[PDB]
């Protein structure tokens, strides 16, 4: 549960530094 | 305690998704 919750996590920071991203370009 | 904070970062990852999604649309 722990590393799902840590899995979650690190989806949405990877989904923000998309976001990110797409704004840079 | 450890759980209370656990889950006002996942609220807070959601408000970030769902603002990503309003600006995508």
Redesign the interface.
């Known amino acids: 549960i722990l590393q799902d919750?840590l899995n979650?996590?690190m989806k949405?920071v990877s989904?923000?530094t998309a976001?990110l991203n797409e704004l840079k370009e």
């Open positions: 919750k979650s996590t949405l989904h923000l976001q």
